[PDB]
Design a protein around this ligand. Structure first.
Ligand SMILES: O=C(NCCN1CCOCC1)c1ccc2c(c1)C(=O)c1ccc(Nc3ccc(F)c(NC(=O)c4ccccc4)c3)cc1OC2
Ligand SMILES: CCCCCCCCO[C@@H]1O[C@H](CO)[C@@H](O)[C@H](O)[C@H]1O
Ligand SMILES: CCCCCCCCO[C@@H]1O[C@H](CO)[C@@H](O)[C@H](O)[C@H]1O
Length: 331
């Protein structure tokens, strides 16, 4: 057991092992500081969970995040370097700290509203898809993928943050509270991101909810007959039928690699059942210089039975505690 020190950060006391020095807030169910791990020589992010066992909902959220982070072992997905608490027993267990790599920026920082070269977009989107293939293979859907959730370092390596829990990158069915989401909700977001890296501007910068849907339909067309067949509500279909051709992406993204355009066309399809998958997209010719079918790994199956369980606050706390106890750092 290491020895801890206390300091006041972001309006609370953070108590962490002495190995982590120079804690500096990076921003804000938890607050994150940059630190330096003097024991490993690595720059790390230390996230202190907020009120982790205050209620059944917080307790299950805490357990969710820890289980997810402990499962994810992939170069393009945030992983756990350490988890700690200053508690010596279950009885005293009230705080949880999660440590990951400090990547040093998110994807907005790497764009600064300027277009990237095609080669650079290839690499960035390749990495996002490789991470998503991995996440999706565990039966986990991100649902809110966006630039602020993509951490990137200076060598341009990317990790996906905040999976399994601005609307500009949201799939239209998420905005419409459709339910029964497909994993390709995430592919929608990837298309929005990729469009923006290529062009320098937001693809669908809606001013509000309905404006966002209006912008989307302008690009991709009103729903076709095969899609309208899958909608029950007559009122909803009546609304849609009272309203648009699908634009040619080759004439929308002028100057882009035609293979980029064709991949965008396969991603930004309104019908989620017809969107390209992550695995399929990794085999698209756009990624020929980076694709290796033997190094795009899948996850071990992830036991998600806890998600349907309704347990007591002390049970969730106990389960989390055990997970903290059993944690073994990665090599
Ligand atoms: O170093 C950074 N800023 C320093 C100051 N800047 C200011 C100006 O110039 C220099 C850069 C910096 C700026 C932005 C970012 C990071 C680091 C980063 O590495 C970074 C690393 C981790 C992180 N979030 C985080 C940390 C620990 C966690 F456990 C989680 N949890 C999850 O991802 C999660 C996963 C599944 C479900 C729920 C949560 C997430 C968020 C991050 O945000 C991007
Ligand atoms: C007016 C905007 C129309 C949006 C239509 C979005 C269609 C999304 O696509 C749909 O997603 C559902 C999964 O969530 C699937 O069950 C449906 O099979 C699929 O067609
Ligand atoms: C003015 C209303 C326009 C709304 C357009 C799309 C709303 C789609 O709505 C969805 O249809 C699904 C398939 O029937 C249902 O399973 C979902 O419950 C429902 O949310």
């Amino acid at each position: 057991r290491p020895t801890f020190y206390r300091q006041e950060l972001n309006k609370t006391i953070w108590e962490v092992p002495e190995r982590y020095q120079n804690l500096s807030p990076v921003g804000s169910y938890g607050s994150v500081c940059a630190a330096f791990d003097t024991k490993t020589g690595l720059r790390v992010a230390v996230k202190k969970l907020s009120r982790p066992f205050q209620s059944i909902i917080h307790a299950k959220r805490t357990y969710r995040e820890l289980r997810l982070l402990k499962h994810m072992k992939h170069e393009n997905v945030i992983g756990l370097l350490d988890v700690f608490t200053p508690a010596r027993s279950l009885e005293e267990f009230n705080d949880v700290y999660l440590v990951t790599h400090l990547m040093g920026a998110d994807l907005n920082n790497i764009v600064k509203c300027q277009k990237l070269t095609d080669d650079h977009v290839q690499f960035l989107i390749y990495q996002i898809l490789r991470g998503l293939k991995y996440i999706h293979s565990a039966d986990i859907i991100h649902r809110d993928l966006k630039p602020s959730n993509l951490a990137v370092n200076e060598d341009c390596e990317l990790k996906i943050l905040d999976f399994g829990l601005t609307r500009w990158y949201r799939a239209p069915e998420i905005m419409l509270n459709w339910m029964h989401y497909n994993q390709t909700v995430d592919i929608w977001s990837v298309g929005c991101i990729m469009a923006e890296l290529l062009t320098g501007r937001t693809l669908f910068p809606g001013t509000d909810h309905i404006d966002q849907l209006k912008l989307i339909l302008r690009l991709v067309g009103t729903p076709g007959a095969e899609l309208l067949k899958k909608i029950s509500s007559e009122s909803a279909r009546n609304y849609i039928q009272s309203l648009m051709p699908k634009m040619n992406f080759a004439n929308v993204f002028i100057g882009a690699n035609p293979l980029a355009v064709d991949l965008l066309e396969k991603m930004l399809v309104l019908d989620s059942d017809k969107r390209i998958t992550a695995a399929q997209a990794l085999a698209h010719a756009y990624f020929a210089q980076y694709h290796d079918p033997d190094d795009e790994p899948v996850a071990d199956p992830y036991d998600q039975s806890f998600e349907s369980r309704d347990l007591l606050i002390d049970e969730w706390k106990s389960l989390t505690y055990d997970e903290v106890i059993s944690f073994v750092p990665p090599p």
